[PDB]
C-alpha cells in the first residue's frame, strides 16, 4: 500500500487541515450524564460519536442513517473507532515556540538566527526586548535590549526602531530573513575565511540553510500558532469504582493550555495593561512547553501525585516509550507461561504440555474441529462443551496437537537457541516437561526456572517452526559451530560406570556369542557389568561406494561395553565404545556418528544414549558420602613443614636479613608449594586407592570412589573443587586483590573456623557482586551491537572481488593461541594459494575451505592464507555469500537472505556474562629467550656489528621470528631499539637459549660508524652540567632540557660527532649528511671528549619509565579514544625538532621529495621514541602507548584496523575461554565503517567537506566512471556502534534506539524520507522482514517497483 515514510515539520494550514474542529473549553465529562461536553477535550461533534452508528442526541440510532450529520447536535453517525483517528486544533492567542526546535542541541532557532540560545530563551520567556528592524539608527537588527535599555532607545527615537518582545518577535525575525541570500553570503564568507572554529560554525549554518532550502520547510513554521490535539481514544478516561475516573497527564496538560489560552484571549479583548498580558503570554508559553516536553526546561509541572506529568515527548521516547514498549516488542495472544520440569522419556523433538494449558491455547482449533465433526452447532455450544470438559473434547485436543509445533522460550533470550519449536505431548500435572539435552541450549536448570509457550497459527508459521526452529535442526552453535547437544550430568556418569572394567569381577574371562548374551547374563545376575570378557562383535563399515560391509571378530572388552554396543548404529566402528566413556568420549562418538551417517541416525543415537545413561545411572546407585572425601595422611606432615618454613622465614625477618616484601613473597611461594604438594598427594591417593585381589595377588586399578568417578567422568566437579573438598583450600585474596599471608588449611570435609570463613566471604561476595552487576552492561552492549548490525543481510552470491584479509596463526612470544586451521576453516579464499617454494597452485581461487582443504593446507606447511572477508565485500546494501563464508550452523555455504548481522550481534553478546567487569590488581624480562629449536629471522631491522662482533639493532620496530624446520613461524618477539644480538639472522638456535639482551631501564644512543667523539655546541651552565658521581667521583655530563636552559641556550643544540684523525665528521655510509647525534633532555654521557669509540658503542643514556573484559570490549566496539594515545607519524620522512612553545616539543616531518606542510606539538611529558634525525614511515610509533583505532584506520588502512580490533576482542574473549568466530567481529567492524568524508568533489555533486555513506560514494563513482568522467576522492571514517547506529539513512531505526528527540528533530528539519529497508523498520511497520523466507517476497516488490 505504501512504500516510504516522509517526515517534516507541519505548517499551521496543514495542522488546521488535520483537525476536524476547534477545542475551546477544558470540560471533559459532565459527571452527571456520561455524555461528553460540547467544545471540550472530549466532544462528539469534533472527534466522533461515543457509540457505534449512533447519535449523541439520539435522533438516529441505525445503520440506515450512516454518513449523515445530525442537525440537533451536529454529531456524525459513523463507527466509534473514528474517535481514534480524528484530531482537533487549538487557536493560540499568541505565537508559541516549539521546544523540540528550541532546547535540543544544537538549537535550530539559535543556529538559524546566528544568535545565542540564552538570548533566545530570554526574549522568548518575556524578560527582554529584541529589535525586528533596527532602522537607520546605531542599534543593530539582531540586538538584545533589556527593559531600561529599551526605554532609553524609545526615548531616543520614538518610532525609528521597531523592537518587540516574545515569540512574536522571534517569528518576525525568522520570517523576515531570506534563506538564499543568507546562504550565499555565508558561502562567500567561508570561502575567504581561514579560522577553524569559524569554518566549522559557517559550514554548520550552511548545512542547515541548505537543508531548509532543499525541503519545503519554512523557518516561521518552527513557531507554533495552531496547536494540534490527540484523539480522545488515545488519551481515554478509564472508568473506576463508583463515579471516580482515572487521571491522565495529557488531559491535565491540555486543560492547562486551554485555560491559559482562554485567559489570554479574555485579557487581550479587555485591553489589559502590558504587564498582565506579558505575564499571561509567558505562562501560556510555559504551559505549551510543559505539554510538549515537561522536564526539558526548568522544573517539570507536577500533578496531584506530587510528580511531573507525562508529556507527549515523555510517552514516545525512552525504554517505556511507544517505540520500545509497543512497537519493537509487544504482548501476544495464544501464549502461556509455566515452570519447567524434566521429562526423561521425551524425544529430542518433543516437549510435555499440561492438559489445561493446551486446552486453553488451542481453543479456536477445538471449536473448529467440534463444529466440523458435528458435536456442536454454534460457537456458544462449543464454548459450553469445552468449559464442561467433555470426553470428546480431549479426543479433539489430541487430534489438533498431533503435528502442531509450539515455541518454547526462556525469559533471557541471549542468542538464537533461546526459543525452539517442539512437538507437544499431553501430560498431567501443572509443569512443562522439557527435554534434558536441550537444557544446555536454554541455559535452564530445574531450580524454579520458568518458560513461555507460543502457538503458531498459520500454515507458514507452523512450517517455519518445523523446518527452521525445530530442536532437531539446531545441533551446532551458530556462534562457533560447536555442537550444542551433549550429555551433561547423569548420562555421562551412567555411560562411564557401564563402560568400565574391574580386574576381578563376576563372570570374568568367559566367552560370549554377542551383545545379547552379555545383556542376558547381566540381567540374570550371572555376570558383572565390569567383567573383562571376550565377545563376538560384528561391525559394519562404509566402503568407497558407501555400501555397508560387515566384519565379525572376537574382541576383548567388558560386559557393559558389549551391552552399550547394541544401541550404536551399524556404520560406526567398535573402537568408540571399547574404552571408559567420559564426557569427551561421548561427544567424540556423537561427532563421529554425525559425520559418518547423517542427522536422523545421530538424533536416534543421542536419544538412545540418554536413555541408556539414565537407566544405568539409576541401576548403579552411585552416592556421595562423608567417607568418599579421603584426606591424605601426609597432609599434616606437609602442613607442619610449611609452618616450620614460614616460622624460619619470620625469624630471619626479625633478625633483619630479609625485608618485608621479599619475606612476604617467599611466604606466599612456600604456601603455594605446600598447597600443590597436598593436592598432588590427595590426587595420587584418590585416583588409585582401590586394590583388588586377583589370584591372591594385590593389584592396583582405577578407583571406584564416587567423588573420583564424578570428577574423572566429567559429569560434575573439577580438579579445583575436588581439591577444595579433600585438600586445603589454598590462599585467598582480599577484596582489593592482595593475597592474604595465612591460607585456609582446612578441608570442606573438616571444619573451617570463623576466621577462614570470614576470609573466604570476601572472594565470595566479590564474585557475587560482579555477577549481579554484569547483566546491565552485557544487555546494553548486546542491544547496541544488535542495532548497529540489524540491517545487514546476505543479498548476493558473489561480488567477484579479488580483495581480502591475510590470516596467520596468532603468537605472542611463547604460545600459539589459534593455529591457521581454525582461522581459515569454512572461509572462501581470495587468491590461489601457491605451494611453498614451488610456485604451484594448491587450492583454486574461489573454493570454500572445508576440513579436507584445511588438512591439505596444514600438511603442506602453509602459514599465511588470504581469504575473502565481510569487511571487503563489494556488495552494497548487504553482503555476499562468498565474501561471508560458510554458515556455522549448517556446514554448507550460507544462503541468500540470512540475517548475518543479528546472528553476529547475538553471538558476540551472549558470552558477555562469562566475562568480567571489575578490574583486577614482577618486572619485564630484559632478554629474549627461545623456547624451541629452529632458525631465526629478522624483520624490519637495520643493525650494525659492534667491536666484539655482536649485532646491535638500530631500528625501532624490529621483529625476531623463530621458525621451525617446515617454515612455520613458531615464535614472534619484538626486539627493542639498541638491543644486542647473541646470534645473527639465519643462524640455528637451541631450546632455552637467549638470543637478544637489552637494558629496558634506559635508552642508549648507538653509533653506526667508528671514530673519535667530538663535542658540538654545549656550554657548562647553559646546556650541560658536569656532575660528579656520589661514590666514584667521575664527572659525567647531563644535558638539561628547555625547562632549565636559558634563552641563550635555547638555540644551542648539543651534538656529538664521529670524526677521523683529520678532525672532520665522517660521512654516513649511504647518506651525504655527516654523522651527528643530538642529545635530548635528561641525557647522561659518560665518555669524555676525544675518546675513541667503535661502532655500536653507547654515546649517551636517556632514562625511561588494565581494564577488564566487558569494559575493554565496550571501548573497542565504541572506538573510544585512549587516555594517552600513541603518537604516530602522519607522513613518511625525516624527523626534526623545532622551537619549543607552550611547554611542548615541535616536530617537523620532511619528505625526501615532497613538501613540508605537517608540524606537530607533542606534549612535554610524552616520551619521544624517535631521535633527532631518524627516518620514520607512515603509522610509526613516535610516543609509546595505546593506539587509537581512528589513527590506525587513517594511517594504515581498513585491513589494519580490522585486524587490530578482531585481535583485541578475540584476546579478551579467549582470556575467559570463549570461542567466537571472527566473522561476527568482522561484520561488526564493517558496520562501523559505513561513512566516508569527501576530499575532492570531482564530477560528483558531493560537498567537499560532507560526510556521506560509503555505498553512495561507491555507486556515484561507478556511475561517473561508466560515462568516462572523473570520480570523487573519499576517506573512510571510523564510528562507534552507537554513533554509527544514530548516523544512518533510516531515521526510524535511529529514533527507535536512543536520543529519539534529537533524531526526530533533525529528521523533521531536514525533511528526510525513509524507505523501509531493514529489519527494524519492517518490524515496526508490521510487514515481512527482508530476510529469511520473507526475503524472496521482498525481492518481488523490488521487481514490481522497477516494472
Partner RNA sequence: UAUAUGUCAGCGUGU
Residues in contact with 930: Cβ distance below 8 Å, sequence separation at least 6, in sequence order: 936, 962, 971, 989, 990, 991, 992, 993, 994, 995
Build a one-symbol-per-residue string for 752-791: x at contacts with RNA by CB under 7 A, - elsewhere.
--------------------x--x----------------
Which residue among 155, 159, 192, 319 contacts DNA (CB under 7 A)?
Answer: 319
Q: How far apart are CA 133 and CA 131, in angstroms?
A: 5
| 235-264 binders of RNA (CB under 7 A) | 238-241, 246
Distance CA(986)–CA(1332), nearest Å, equals 55
Does residue 445 bind Mg ion (CB under 5 A)? yes
Question: Which of positions 603-662 make contact with other proteins (CB under 8 A)?
Answer: 603
| For Mg ion, the closer CB: 118 or 337 | 337
**Cβ closest to Mg ion, residue 209 vs residue 417:** 417
Q: Which of residues 672-731 bind other proteins (CB under 8 A)?
A: none
Residue 899 contacts other proteins per CB under 8 A = yes
Among 30-38, 546-554, 783-791, 1085-1093, the segment contacting other proteins (CB under 8 A):
783-791
- Residue 1161 CA, chain-centre distance (Å), reads 35
Cα 303 to Cα 100, 248, 250, 809: the distances in Å are 23, 10, 11, 65
**Helix residue ranges, H only, 390-514:** 391-400, 439-442, 459-467, 490-498
Could you say which of 86, 89, 281, 296 contacts DNA (CB under 7 A)? Answer: 296
Q: Is 114 annotated as a binding residue?
A: no
Tell which one of 4, 151, 526, 720 touches other proteins (CB under 8 A). 4
Residue 238 binding: pick among Zn ion, RNA, Mg ion, none (C-beta 5-8 Å cut-off by kind): RNA
Residue 1289 binds: one of Mg ion, other proteins, DNA, none (C-beta under 5 to 8 A by kind): none
Q: Is 883 annotated as a binding residue?
A: yes
**Among other proteins, Mg ion, RNA, none, residue 24 binds (CB under 5-8 Å by kind):** none
Q: Which residue is nearest to Zn ion (CB)?
A: 883
Q: Is 57 annotated as a binding residue?
A: yes
Q: State the binding partner of 945 from other proteins, Zn ion, RNA, none, CB within 5 to 8 A by kind.
A: none
55: annotated binding-site residue? yes
What does 1051 bind: DNA, Zn ion, Mg ion, none (CB cut-off 5 to 8 Å by kind)?
none
By CB under 8 A, tell whether 238 contacts other proteins. Answer: yes
Among 4, 68, 411, 1161, binds RNA (CB under 7 A): 411
The reply to whether 769 sits near DNA by the rule CB under 7 A is no
The residue range among 4-12, 439-447, 854-862, 938-946 that interacts with RNA, by the rule CB under 7 A, is 439-447
Q: Which long-range contacts (CB under 8 A, 24 or more apart) does 987-992 make?
A: 987/935, 987/936, 988/933, 988/934, 988/935, 988/936, 989/930, 989/933, 989/934, 989/935, 989/936, 989/962, 990/930, 990/933, 991/930, 991/931, 991/932, 991/933, 992/929, 992/930, 992/931
Helices (H), 1014-1153: 1109-1118
229 binds other proteins (CB under 8 A): yes
Q: Which does 1239 bind (CB under 5 to 8 A by kind): Zn ion, RNA, Mg ion, none?
A: none
Instruction: Report which of 1228, 1209, 1229 is spatially closest to residue 1219, judged by C-alpha positions.
Output: 1209
458 binds other proteins (CB under 8 A): yes
**Residues in 418-447 that interact with other proteins by CB under 8 A:** 418-419
880 annotated as ligand-binding: yes
* Residue 1296 neighbours by CB distance under 10 Å: 22
The yes or no reply on residue 1248 touching Mg ion (CB under 5 A) is no
Please choose which of RNA, DNA, Zn ion, none residue 783 contacts, taking the beta carbon within 5 to 8 angstroms, the exact cut-off set by kind.
DNA
State the Cα–Cα distance between residues 1028 and 1091, nearest whole angstrom. Answer: 19
Cβ nearer to RNA, comparing 307 with 765: 307
Decide: is 1045 part of the binding site for other proteins (CB under 8 A): no
Q: Which helix (H) or strand (E) holds 1037?
A: strand 1035-1039
Site for other proteins in 902-931 (CB under 8 A): 902-903, 905-906
Give the footprint of DNA on residues 215-254 (CB under 7 A): 238, 240, 244, 246-247
Interface ranges with Zn ion (CB under 5 A): 55, 57, 59, 70, 72-73, 75, 799, 873, 880, 883
Q: Is 389 in the site for RNA (CB under 7 A)?
A: no
3-state secondary structure (DSSP) of residue 308: strand
> By CB under 7 A, what part of segment 290-309 binds RNA?
305, 307
CB of 659 to RNA, least distance (A): 47
Q: Consult the annotation and say whether 70 binds a ligand.
A: yes
Cα–Cα distance for residue pair 903/1223, rounded to 1 Å: 10
**Least distance CB 327 / DNA (angstroms):** 13
Which H/E stretch holds residue 227? strand 223-229
Contact status: 385 vs other proteins (CB under 8 A):
no
User: Quick one: which of 205, 256, 282, 416 contacts other proteins (CB under 8 A)?
Assistant: 416
d(CA 1175, CA 710): 63
Q: Which three cell numbers stand for residue 774?
A: 554484569
CA distance 830 to 844: 9
Residues numbered 1068-1087 forming contacts with DNA, rule: CB under 7 A: none
- Cα distances from 1153 to residues 595, 1023, 1133, 1149, in angstroms, run 62, 34, 9, 12
Given strand 1235-1240, what is the order of strands in its sheet?
A: 1251-1253, 1235-1240, 1273-1277
**Under DSSP, is residue 685 helix (H, G, I), strand (E, B) or coil?**
helix
When binding is defined by CB under 8 A, the residue of 264, 414, 610, 1206 that contacts other proteins is 414
Task: CB nearer to other proteins: give 952 or 1329.
Answer: 1329
Query: Residue 840 interacts with DNA (CB under 7 A)?
Result: no
Verify cis geometry, omega within 30 degrees of 0, for the bond prior to 106.
yes
Q: Residue 1003 and residue 1014: Cα distance in Å, rounded?
A: 21
Residues 403 and 39: their CA atoms lie apart, in Å, by 58
The set of cell numbers assigned to 379 is 460457537
Chain centroid, CA 1045 distance in Å: 51
Q: Is 403 a residue that touches other proteins (CB under 8 A)?
A: yes
Instruction: Say if residue 73 carries a ligand binding annotation.
Output: yes
Q: Do 882 and 798 contact (CB within 8 A), yes or no?
A: yes
Region of 839 on the Ramachandran plot (φ > 0 left; ψ -120 to 50 alpha; else beta)? left
Task: Say how far apart CA 1259 and CA 1265 lie, in whole Å.
Answer: 10
Q: Which is nearer to DNA, 466 or 1320 (CB)?
A: 1320
- Which residues, numbered 938-967, are part of the site for DNA (CB under 7 A)? none
Choosing among Zn ion, Mg ion, other proteins, none, which partner's interface includes residue 788 (Cβ < 5 to 8 Å by kind)?
none
Should residue 457 be labelled a site residue for other proteins when binding is judged by CB under 8 A?
Answer: yes
Q: Closer to Zn ion at the Cβ: 880 or 1279?
A: 880
Q: Which of 1258, 1259, 1257, 1239 is nearest to 1249 (CA)?
A: 1239
Query: Hey, which residues between 1208 and 1237 contact other proteins (CB under 8 A)?
Result: none
873 a known binding residue? yes
445 marked as part of a ligand binding site: yes
- Is residue 183 a known part of a binding site? no
Can you tell me whether residue 154 is helix, strand or coil? helix
Cell numbers 589513527: residue = 1191
CB of 775 to DNA, least distance (A): 3
In the list other proteins, Zn ion, RNA, none, the entry touching 240 (Cβ below 5 to 8 angstroms by class) is: RNA
Residue 593 among known ligand-binding residues? no
Binding-site residues for Mg(2+), in ranges, read: 445, 447, 449
Binding-site residues for Zn(2+), in ranges, read: 55, 57, 70, 73, 799, 873, 880, 883
- Give me the residues that bind Mg ion (CB under 5 A), please: 445, 447, 449
- Give me the residues that bind RNA (CB under 7 A), please: 238-241, 246, 305, 307, 310, 320, 363, 379, 383, 411-412, 443, 445, 447-449, 772, 775
Amino acid at each position: 500500500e505504501f512504500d516510504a515514510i516522509k517526515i517534516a515539520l507541519a505548517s499551521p494550514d496543514m495542522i488546521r487541515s488535520w483537525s476536524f474542529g476547534e477545542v475551546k473549553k477544558p470540560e471533559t465529562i459532565n459527571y452527571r450524564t456520561f455524555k461528553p461536553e460540547r467544545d471540550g477535550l472530549f466532544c462528539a461533534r469534533i472527534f466522533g460519536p461515543v457509540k457505534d452508528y449512533e447519535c449523541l442526541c439520539g435522533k438516529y440510532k441505525r445503520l440506515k442513517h450512516r454518513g449523515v450529520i445530525c442537525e440537533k447536535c451536529g454529531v456524525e453517525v459513523t463507527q466509534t473507532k473514528v474517535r481514534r483517528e480524528r484530531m482537533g486544533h487549538i487557536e493560540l492567542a499568541s505565537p508559541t515556540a516549539h521546544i523540540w526546535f528550541l532546547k535540543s542541541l544544537p538549537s535550530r532557532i539559535g543556529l538559524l538566527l546566528d544568535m545565542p540560545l540564552r538570548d533566545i530563551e530570554r526574549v522568548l520567556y518575556f524578560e527582554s526586548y529584541v529589535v525586528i528592524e533596527g532602522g537607520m539608527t546605531n542599534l543593530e537588527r539582531q540586538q538584545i535590549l533589556t527593559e531600561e535599555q529599551y526605554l532609553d532607545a524609545l526615548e531616543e527615537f520614538g518610532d525609528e526602531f521597531d523592537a518587540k518582545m516574545g515569540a512574536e518577535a522571534i517569528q518576525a525575525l525568522l520570517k523576515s530573513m531570506d534563506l538564499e541570500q543568507e546562504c550565499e553570503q555565508l558561502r562567500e564568507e567561508l570561502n575567504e575565511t581561514n579560522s577553524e572554529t569559524k569554518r566549522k560554525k559557517l559550514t554548520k549554518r550552511i548545512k542547515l540553510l541548505e537543508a531548509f532550502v532543499q525541503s519545503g520547510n519554512k523557518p516561521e513554521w518552527m513557531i507554533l500558532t495552531v496547536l494540534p490535539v490527540l484523539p480522545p481514544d488515545l488519551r481515554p478516561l478509564v472508568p473506576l469504582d463508583g463515579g471516580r475516573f482515572a487521571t491522565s497527564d495529557l488531559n491535565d496538560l491540555y486543560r492547562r493550555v486551554i485555560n491559559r489560552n482562554n485567559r489570554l484571549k479574555r485579557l487581550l479583548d479587555l485591553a489589559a495593561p502590558d504587564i498582565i498580558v506579558r505575564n499571561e503570554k509567558r505562562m501560556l508559553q510555559e504551559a505549551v512547553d510543559a505539554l510538549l516536553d515537561n522536564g526539558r526546561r526548568g522544573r517539570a509541572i507536577t500533578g496531584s501525585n506530587k510528580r511531573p506529568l507525562k508529556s507527549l515527548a515523555d510517552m514516545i521516547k525512552g525504554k517505556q516509550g511507544r517505540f520500545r514498549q509497543n512497537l519493537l516488542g509487544k504482548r501476544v495472544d495464544y501464549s502461556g507461561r509455566s515452570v519447567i520440569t524434566v521429562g526423561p522419556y521425551l524425544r529430542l523433538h518433543q516437549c510435555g504440555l499440561p492438559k489445561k494449558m493446551a486446552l486453553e491455547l488451542f481453543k479456536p482449533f477445538i471449536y473448529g474441529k467440534l463444529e466440523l465433526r458435528g458435536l456442536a452447532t454454534t460457537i456458544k455450544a462449543a464454548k459450553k462443551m469445552v468449559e464442561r470438559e467433555e470426553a470428546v473434547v480431549w479426543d479433539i485436543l489430541d487430534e489438533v496437537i498431533r503435528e502442531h509445533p509450539v515455541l518454547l522460550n526462556r525469559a533471557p533470550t541471549l542468542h538464537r537457541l533461546g526459543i525452539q519449536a517442539f512437538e507437544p505431548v499431553l501430560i498431567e500435572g501443572k509443569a512443562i516437561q522439557l527435554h534434558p539435552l536441550v537444557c544446555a541450549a536454554y541455559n535452564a536448570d530445574f531450580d524454579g526456572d520458568q518458560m513461555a509457550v507460543h502457538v503458531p497459527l498459520t500454515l507458514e508459521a507452523q512450517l517455519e517452526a518445523r523446518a527452521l526452529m525445530m530442536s532437531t535442526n539446531n545441533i551446532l552453535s551458530p556462534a562457533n559451530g560447536e555442537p550444542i547437544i551433549v550429555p551433561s550430568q547423569d548420562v555421562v556418569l551412567g555411560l562411564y560406570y557401564m563402560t568400565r572394567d574391574c580386574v576381578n569381577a563376576k563372570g570374568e574371562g568367559m566367552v560370549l556369542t554377542g551383545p545379547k548374551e552379555a545383556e542376558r547374563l547381566y540381567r540374570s545376575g550371572l555376570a558383572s557389568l565390569h567383567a573383562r570378557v571376550k565377545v563376538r562383535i560384528t561391525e559394519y563399515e562404509k566402503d568407497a561406494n558407501g555400501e555397508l560391509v560387515a566384519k565379525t571378530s572376537l574382541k576383548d572388552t567388558t560386559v557393559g561395553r558389549a551391552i552399550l554396543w547394541m544401541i550404536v548404529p551399524k556404520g560406526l566402528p567398535y573402537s568408540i565404545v571399547n574404552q571408559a566413556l567420559g564426557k569427551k568420549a561421548i561427544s567424540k562418538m556423537l561427532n563421529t556418528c554425525y559425520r559418518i551417517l547423517g542427522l536422523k541416525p545421530t538424533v536416534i543415537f543421542a536419544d538412545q544414549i540418554m536413555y541408556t545413561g539414565f537407566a544405568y545411572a539409576a541401576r548403579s546407585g552411585a552416592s556421595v558420602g562423608i567417607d568418599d572425601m579421603v584426606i591424605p595422611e601426609k597432609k599434616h606432615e606437609i602442613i607442619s613443614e610449611a609452618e616450620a618454613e614460614v616460622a624460619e622465614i619470620q625469624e630471619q625477618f626479625q633478625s633483619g636479613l630479609v625485608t618485608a616484601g621479599e619475606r612476604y613473597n617467599k611466604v606466599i611461594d612456600i604456601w603455594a608449594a605446600a598447597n600443590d604438594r597436598v593436592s598432588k598427594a590427595m590426587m595420587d591417593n584418590l585416583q588409585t586407592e582401590t586394590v583388588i585381589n586377583r589370584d591372591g595377588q594385590e593389584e592396583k586399578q582405577v578407583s571406584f570412589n564416587s567423588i573420583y568417578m564424578m570428577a574423572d567422568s566429567g559429569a560434575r566437579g573439577s580438579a579445583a573443587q575436588i581439591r577444595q573438598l579433600a585438600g586445603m583450600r589454598g590462599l585467598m585474596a582480599k577484596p582489593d586483590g592482595s593475597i592474604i599471608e595465612t591460607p585456609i588449611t582446612a578441608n570442606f570435609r573438616e571444619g573451617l573456623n570463623v576466621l577462614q570463613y570470614f576470609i573466604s566471604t570476601h572472594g565470595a561476595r566479590k564474585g557475587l557482586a560482579d555477577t549481579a552487576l554484569k547483566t546491565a552492561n552485557s544487555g546494553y552492549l548486546t542491544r547496541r551491537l544488535v542495532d548497529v548490525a540489524q540491517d545487514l543481510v546476505v543479498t548476493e552470491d558473489d561480488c567477484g572481488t579479488h580483495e581480502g584479509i591475510m590470516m596467520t596463526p596468532v603468537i605472542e612470544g611463547g604460545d600459539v593461541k589459534e593455529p591457521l586451521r581454525d582461522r581459515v576453516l569454512g572461509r572462501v579464499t581470495a587468491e590461489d594459494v601457491l605451494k611453498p617454494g614451488t610456485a604451484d597452485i594448491l587450492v583454486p581461487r574461489n573454493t570454500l575451505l572445508h576440513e579436507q582443504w584445511c588438512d591439505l593446507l596444514e600438511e603442506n606447511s602453509v602459514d599465511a592464507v588470504k581469504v575473502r572477508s565481510v569487511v571487503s565485500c563489494d556488495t552494497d546494501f548487504g553482503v555476499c555469500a562468498h565474501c561471508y563464508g560458510r554458515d556455522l550452523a549448517r556446514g554448507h555455504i550460507i544462503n541468500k537472505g540470512e540475517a548475518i548481522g543479528v546472528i553476529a550481534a547475538q553471538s558476540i553478546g551472549e558470552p558477555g556474562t562469562q566475562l568480567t567487569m571489575r578490574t583486577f590488581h614482577a618486572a619485564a624480562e630484559s632478554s629474549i629467550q627461545v623456547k624451541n629449536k629452529g632458525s631465526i629471522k629478522l624483520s624490519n631491522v637495520k643493525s650494525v656489528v659492534n667491536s666484539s662482533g655482536k649485532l646491535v639493532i638500530t631500528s625501532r620496530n624490529t621483529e625476531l621470528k623463530l621458525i621451525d624446520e617446515f617454515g612455520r613461524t613458531k615464535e614472534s618477539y619484538k626486539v627493542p631499539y639498541g638491543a644486542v644480538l647473541a646470534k645473527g639472522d639465519g643462524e640455528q638456535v637451541a631450546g632455552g637459549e637467549t638470543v637478544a639482551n637489552w637494558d629496558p631501564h634506559t635508552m642508549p644512543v648507538i653509533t653506526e660508524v667508528s671514530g673519535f667523539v667530538r663535542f658540538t655546541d654545549m656550554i657548562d651552565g647553559q646546556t650541560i652540567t658536569r656532575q660528579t658521581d656520589e661514590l666514584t667521583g667521575l664527572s659525567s655530563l647531563v644535558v638539561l632540557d628547555s625547562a632549565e636552559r636559558t634563552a641563550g641556550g635555547k638555540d644551542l643544540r648539543p651534538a656529538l660527532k664521529i670524526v677521523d684523525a683529520q678532525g672532520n665528521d665522517v660521512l654516513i655510509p649511504g647518506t651525504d649528511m655527516p654523522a651527528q647525534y643530538f642529545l635530548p633532555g635528561k641525557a647522561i654521557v659518560q665518555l669524555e671528549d676525544g675518546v675513541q669509540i667503535s661502532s655500536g658503542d653507547t654515546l649517551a643514556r636517556i632514562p625511561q619509565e588494565i581494564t577488564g573484559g566487558l569494559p575493554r570490549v565496550a571501548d573497542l566496539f565504541e572506538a573510544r579514544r585512549p587516555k594517552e594515545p600513541a603518537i604516530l607519524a602522519e607522513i613518511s620522512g625525516i624527523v626534526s625538532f623545532g622551537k619549543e612553545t607552550k611547554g611542548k616539543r615541535r616536530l617537523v616531518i620532511t619528505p625526501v621529495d615532497g613538501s613540508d606542510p605537517y608540524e606537530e606539538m607533542i606534549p612535554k611529558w610524552r616520551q619521544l621514541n624517535v631521535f633527532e634525525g631518524e627516518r620514520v614511515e607512515r603509522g610509526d610509533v613516535i610516543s609509546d602507548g595505546p593506539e587509537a583505532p581512528h589513527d590506525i584506520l587513517r594511517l594504515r588502512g581498513v585491513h589494519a584496523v580490522t585486524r587490530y580490533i578482531v585481535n583485541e576482542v578475540q584476546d579478551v574473549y579467549r582470556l575467559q575461554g570463549v570461542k567466537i568466530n571472527d566473522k561476527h567481529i568482522e561484520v561488526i567492524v564493517r558496520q562501523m565503517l559505513r561513512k566516508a568524508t569527501i576530499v575532492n568533489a570531482g564530477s560528483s555533486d558531493f560537498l567537499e567537506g560532507e560526510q556521506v555513506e560509503y555505498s553512495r560514494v561507491k555507486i556515484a563513482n561507478r556511475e561517473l566512471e561508466a560515462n568516462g568522467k572523473v570520480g570523487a576522492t573519499y576517506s573512510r571514517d571510523l564510528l562507534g556502534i552507537t554513533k554509527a547506529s544514530l548516523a544512518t539513512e533510516s531515521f526510524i531505526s535511529a529514533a527507535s534506539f536512543q536520543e529519539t528527540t534529537r533524531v526526530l528533530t533533525e529528521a523533521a528539519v531536514a525533511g528526510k524520507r525513509d524507505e523501509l529497508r531493514g529489519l527494524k523498520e519492517n518490524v515496526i511497520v508490521g510487514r515481512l522482514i527482508p530476510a529469511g523466507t520473507g526475503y524472496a517476497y521482498h525481492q518481488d516488490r523490488m521487481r514490481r517497483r522497477a516494472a
